[PDB]
Amino acid sequence: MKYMITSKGDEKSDLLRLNMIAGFGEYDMEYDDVEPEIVISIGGDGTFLSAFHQYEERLDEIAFIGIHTGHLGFYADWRPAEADKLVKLLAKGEYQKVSYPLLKTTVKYGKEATYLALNESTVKSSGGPFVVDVVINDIHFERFRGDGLCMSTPSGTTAYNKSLGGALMHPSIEAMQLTEMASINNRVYRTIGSPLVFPKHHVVSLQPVNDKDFQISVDHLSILHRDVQEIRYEVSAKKIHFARFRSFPFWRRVHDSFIED
Amino acid sequence: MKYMITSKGDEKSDLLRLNMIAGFGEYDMEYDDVEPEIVISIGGDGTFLSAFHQYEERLDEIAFIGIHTGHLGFYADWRPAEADKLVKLLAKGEYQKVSYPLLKTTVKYGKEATYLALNESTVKSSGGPFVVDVVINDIHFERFRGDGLCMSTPSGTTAYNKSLGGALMHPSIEAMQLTEMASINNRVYRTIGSPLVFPKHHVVSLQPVNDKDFQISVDHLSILHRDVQEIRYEVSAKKIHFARFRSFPFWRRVHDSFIED
Amino acid sequence: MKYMITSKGDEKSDLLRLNMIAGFGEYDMEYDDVEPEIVISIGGDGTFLSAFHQYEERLDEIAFIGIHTGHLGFYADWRPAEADKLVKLLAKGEYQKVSYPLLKTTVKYGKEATYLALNESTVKSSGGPFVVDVVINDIHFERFRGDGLCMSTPSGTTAYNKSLGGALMHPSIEAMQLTEMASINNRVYRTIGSPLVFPKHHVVSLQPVNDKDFQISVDHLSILHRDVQEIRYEVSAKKIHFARFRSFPFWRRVHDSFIED
Amino acid sequence: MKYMITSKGDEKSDLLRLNMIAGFGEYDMEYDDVEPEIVISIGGDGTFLSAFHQYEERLDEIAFIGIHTGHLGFYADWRPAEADKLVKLLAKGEYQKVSYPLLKTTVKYGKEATYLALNESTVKSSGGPFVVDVVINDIHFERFRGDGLCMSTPSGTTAYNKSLGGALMHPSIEAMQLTEMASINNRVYRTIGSPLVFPKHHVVSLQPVNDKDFQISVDHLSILHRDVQEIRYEVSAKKIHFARFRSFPFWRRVHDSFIED
Numbered sequence A, B, C, D: 001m002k003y004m005i006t007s008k009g010d011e012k013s014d015l016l017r018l019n020m021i022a023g024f025g026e027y028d029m030e031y032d033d034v035e036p037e038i039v040i041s042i043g044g045d046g047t048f049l050s051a052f053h054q055y056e057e058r059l060d061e062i063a064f065i066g067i068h069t070g071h072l073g074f075y076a077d078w079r080p081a082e083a084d085k086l087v088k089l090l091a092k093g094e095y096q097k098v099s100y101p102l103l104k105t106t107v108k109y110g111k112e113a114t115y116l117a118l119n120e121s122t123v124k125s126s127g128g129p130f131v132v133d134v135v136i137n138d139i140h141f142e143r144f145r146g147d148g149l150c151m152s153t154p155s156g157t158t159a160y161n162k163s164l165g166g167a168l169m170h171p172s173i174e175a176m177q178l179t180e181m182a183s184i185n186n187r188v189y190r191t192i193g194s195p196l197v198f199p200k201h202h203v204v205s206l207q208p209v210n211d212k213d214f215q216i217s218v219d220h221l222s223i224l225h226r227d228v229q230e231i232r233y234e235v236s237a238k239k240i241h242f243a244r245f246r247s248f249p250f251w252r253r254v255h256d257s258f259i260e261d
């Protein structure tokens, strides 16, 4: 089918990409980076995140595969020595697909912008602590004072979320997880402290108290947002699809990345 | 229908129980503590946990209601001033039911004992640190050295799980959450650290390394287990059913118990 | 003696300041904001931090006093109702002085700038995670990847340090405490995790790995630093002096601010 | 001088002990385990803790040395390959001594028992959560509900204290650090959460609320205490003395044990 390959852009990844293109040329496979059905990312998880965002408008037509030319990735979970086996099984096709949940982020300013996240979306201020009201399904839950907030997908829970004390969640769970960054807690200021895990259809709204300018990130992409009225989080109806050719369980990937490999 | 009322056993709860029995006597409602269809717990969450375990063999035939004669409870979420309104709406019936997930704990010793938990099940040793191998879906995930491990239901996440750094999970999510108690981490010993959230059908097995005697708790009930070969955790196929008469969202209950009320 | 009064600048603080100046006019007390021997801060801890920095070059000639016109402060630990009693005991003088340790921050760029902190100094990057080598007394201790690092004085331990998981340290201890902000830890990246407490004469050096631009804060003052070669932390030889008129123990101040009041 | 050697008791440690005794026999060195001036511990930190407690009544007459026949220890910080060099430099003598602070634990029951700790002393209940009032220098600071409390020496901060979230403190600091084990925090129950670091001469008193029976540990030794009225903690006036023959800085020992070696 139509496929394309993104590369980290160092010599090792660029050369592996060229060798895989050569191997695909021996099958009924057409290189097409406009409407691919297969997107192969060669690099690390950063490269994979960029592949996801390059093709976020055609997620339901695409199966993603990641090859890690460095250390094992949570998305780039194939080794370069298996690239030839990958070309072979990918050309034939008929592989099974695995789908992970995504996070929808809506930013309102007086209009709306929407974003999809594979890892997480975070909100911080223009320096120092900021203040946001946290509203869950239209009920005021807490006034947060601190460095920021992080809302993670299940597959993102091993990323920023983990460093913030969040739980690691198996990606078959359709949920998002909100973690705090250095909240102030004293007699006057009060937050929940604990990470919060939300099911599908719950909406978490972050609303300004004084300052209306925030730094909002979606995966690696961080942009200063001015005149923001609201940041709304919910589990997306869209999913990312992976081509899988062998069993590599999430919990084994967690073991291999954090425990020992 | 058939109903019964458990009491914390102080004067306030005992008297409220007698007044509710009097009120039920004006409707087609029969007091029956052998095969009730409605179980009302008057006290706090401890009283409610005990009601759950008193009737754990007939969970699919029972709707539970909790009245808190002290502070607001996560299970005992009705005020005593509303007991008369409760009798009224309960006698008529036709209320909606809400169901929360439960945790199945299997203890193997060379035979099996199974237990159901509404809050959590924990494993500790006979003093000092103990060592257990943690096996997830038959793959060895970590060797845990420390004080113990806690496996929580969603509604249990606001209990022991929270004090151990776990995430708070909305109880519509069919999952269990494993948290660590003071794990040892150095160059030689390694655990994940982070809480782990498992979906239905995942099995987490705790297996001895040296000592085979453990203290195992299920909700409040803690018993020394000798010659243990394995402790297996999975989300139960059984659920607890609550009678609900008004909206009291989980996230509002969290707000009211931990943020302000 | 020579004294001055800084105000938060709202009506309540401005009026209390004018009334205290009137009261001081009945004693041998001269208002002098160039070379005061007594600096009274009326507001909150932010106002007090600003008073400290306004007079950081004459710290050994000054005794500070803070009045909190809002909630109790850790520095502004006097109530406005006692301002008249304060004027009285301050005019007479001969009060005892209490001294807290300070943090010296040296920034090297190829020259040096030095700063004094009463709460803490922090280092962050120009967005996303940054990388710094942490060198303790000239031995490489860790390569830190994450959001930033915080080095706190003892009296600062109840501030940002606390929100980052640091220990609360009694201010009679001549030490500084380093805490992490969201460190990355996986098979490849490794930090200590735990807060670190350093005695006097230990030097902690933060050194760039790739990017050389950082955001450095000293108490409230945050400035972008370009072409930084090193940030060095050590307990200062200078101390801040408080005028004390009654016993208000640090641990009682902690109790009153975080437990109940 | 008079010396003795304790062994872990496995073949490797027993044989190294016999070889060191043979080497000492070539110098003016007398084996004496009643009144040694040098105590050499061969094993790990557990063996070293036991050596300390074997000779806790003659701490000011003894310099301790630890050899680790397994992984590097924080107390057993010499390698077995250097035992011959150790015998040599130890026989000559005139080495420098390094002293670490200790923790005094006083247990009152209606009489007093006192204990010295090199790592920590902890208090837990006879199962489930217990309740203790925490009194600092005779002022009630908090009512703690949870699993237990840990009071650590500086050199103990890398042990249980670290697993509980405590700060790592350089052992030149004369202090003790109190950490919580799974405290309950809700609208009704409130603790500080943060580790607390106390200077010399501060006294932290733990006092019963209901149950008067506790499990009290001092280093490895854990004993059920009945009819306890109070547990008092303070930095001891006594210190442990180490014989040092080369520079092995505490922060390098921390690096080597937790970061990489």
Ligand SMILES: Nc1ncnc2c1ncn2[C@@H]1O[C@H](CN(CC#Cc2nc3c(N)ncnc3n2[C@@H]2O[C@H](CO)[C@@H](O)[C@H]2O)CCCO)[C@@H](O)[C@H]1O
Binding pocket: A044, A045, A046, A049, A073, A074, A119, A120, A155, A156, A157, A158, A159, A160, A161, A163, A219, A220, C128, C129, C145, C146, C147, C181, C182, C183, C184, C186
């Ligand atoms: N203080 C922080 N702590 C922890 N994580 C943080 C912090 N700040 C940002 N992040 C994560 O960085 C993601 C963006 N980043 C690409 C990626 C990724 C990724 N995805 C993962 C996943 N799902 N599980 C487990 N490791 C995952 N990584 C790893 O993260 C490290 C940092 O890249 C590298 O080892 C990656 O293999 C590039 C960032 C630099 O340009 C941003 O999305 C946010 O998550």
Ligand SMILES: Nc1ncnc2c1ncn2[C@@H]1O[C@H](CN(CC#Cc2nc3c(N)ncnc3n2[C@@H]2O[C@H](CO)[C@@H](O)[C@H]2O)CCCO)[C@@H](O)[C@H]1O
Binding pocket: B044, B045, B046, B049, B073, B074, B119, B120, B155, B156, B157, B158, B159, B160, B161, B163, B219, B220, D128, D129, D145, D146, D147, D181, D182, D183, D184, D186
């Ligand atoms: N170190 C610990 N930290 C935190 N929680 C702990 C710890 N150790 C045990 N637990 C919890 O105690 C549950 C058993 N207990 C009855 C209950 C309950 C309960 N259930 C809750 C829920 N789901 N959400 C939020 N608060 C909930 N509580 C509250 O807990 C406090 C202690 O009861 C009281 O305020 C209760 O309203 C009786 C215990 C004494 O006999 C045991 O099941 C374990 O969870």
Ligand SMILES: Nc1ncnc2c1ncn2[C@@H]1O[C@H](CN(CC#Cc2nc3c(N)ncnc3n2[C@@H]2O[C@H](CO)[C@@H](O)[C@H]2O)CCCO)[C@@H](O)[C@H]1O
Binding pocket: A128, A129, A145, A146, A147, A181, A182, A183, A184, A186, C044, C045, C046, C049, C073, C074, C119, C120, C155, C156, C157, C158, C159, C160, C161, C163, C219, C220
């Ligand atoms: N994410 C954070 N979490 C926690 N603290 C943070 C975070 N980021 C910065 N800080 C602290 O703010 C100090 C600067 N700030 C003035 C001050 C102070 C102060 N000093 C204290 C002390 N020693 N003990 C206990 N509470 C203390 N506060 C309180 O902090 C809150 C925030 O001011 C207010 O209740 C103050 O009474 C003004 C900041 C806004 O313009 C900066 O120095 C850093 O510490």
Ligand SMILES: Nc1ncnc2c1ncn2[C@@H]1O[C@H](CN(CC#Cc2nc3c(N)ncnc3n2[C@@H]2O[C@H](CO)[C@@H](O)[C@H]2O)CCCO)[C@@H](O)[C@H]1O
Binding pocket: B128, B129, B145, B146, B147, B181, B182, B183, B184, B186, D044, D045, D046, D049, D073, D074, D119, D120, D155, D156, D157, D158, D159, D160, D161, D163, D219, D220
């Ligand atoms: N949940 C816990 N988490 C963390 N530590 C705990 C926990 N519970 C007890 N402890 C510590 O155990 C000490 C008693 N123990 C001997 C020792 C020691 C020691 N001392 C150290 C130091 N100062 N710094 C750094 N590592 C140090 N260790 C290491 O601890 C591990 C467990 O021994 C081993 O790697 C030892 O090298 C024997 C215990 C078994 O019989 C008890 O004193 C308490 O600290």
